[PDB]
Write a protein that binds this ligand. Structure first.
Ligand SMILES: [Cl-]
Ligand SMILES: [Cl-]
Ligand SMILES: [Zn+2]
Ligand SMILES: [Zn+2]
Lengths: 21, 30, 30, 21, 30, 21, 30, 21, 30, 21, 30, 21
């Protein structure tokens, strides 16, 4: 999930947008 | 832009800055 | 607990603290 | 909604808790 | 609500959100 | 103290209220 | 250092930075 | 007090330092 | 991404997120 | 400048990106 | 004042609080 | 740099002022 993508691994701002509504 | 570790409140702050008015979900359990 | 006056990202931080591992959804108007 | 309420007025942690998953 | 690790500035931010107008003390030395 | 309770270990928002005035 | 305009949790963050391991007390009016 | 001063006016880090334990 | 309304330290946080390891400069007026 | 623009009006992440080193 | 670890967004928040109107540069690459 | 001085090692607010403009 987001934590694995962005905290445990690294993510871009674009990937973060995956979690917008 | 960059890729970096975003954890915890920083992660949700980042979601808040990327999504803004669209809103977002933060669902750490998946 | 006390009542809160929370704008912007402060609300998201508060949601983060309140919801913990449950996560939350942030759904502004418009 | 809650995002507006907390900013234009006040809101409680208990109200906020309703927005947890 | 939840239980979670609250450290550093995040801890005092959490105290600020729980205590608000009551105020609080942050005394890491004990 | 608070650091041991809440940072080193975990604490609830209620426990955090222990440190309000 | 420069003078500060700090509201809400920003003040608490500032106190946190200024006081370090000494900690601090946050005592709003009323 | 300091909480109000910093928000309605300005305050210095030196003023803030008075609130350390 | 959405447009941003960022004051104070919120702008700096945003710059931090946007610039990552590149860093950034924060240059207010006056 | 950008610091004022973002606060008195709005600004985009793309605008902000111009301030990276 | 104190000496403490200031990392990441907390570091830039601290720079923002120490430098304010002077502005600052955050250049992690050196 | 600043990260080494202040994050990896520890720094004072005065040292932080080294990175003001
Ligand atoms: Cl952290
Ligand atoms: Cl604010
Ligand atoms: Zn943090
Ligand atoms: Zn704020």
């Amino acid at each position: 999930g987001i934590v694995e993508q962005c905290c445990t691994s690294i993510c871009s701002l674009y990937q973060l947008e995956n979690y917008c509504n | 832009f960059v890729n970096q570790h975003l954890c915890g409140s920083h992660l949700v702050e980042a979601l808040y800055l990327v999504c803004g008015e669209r809103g977002f979900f933060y669902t750490p359990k998946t």
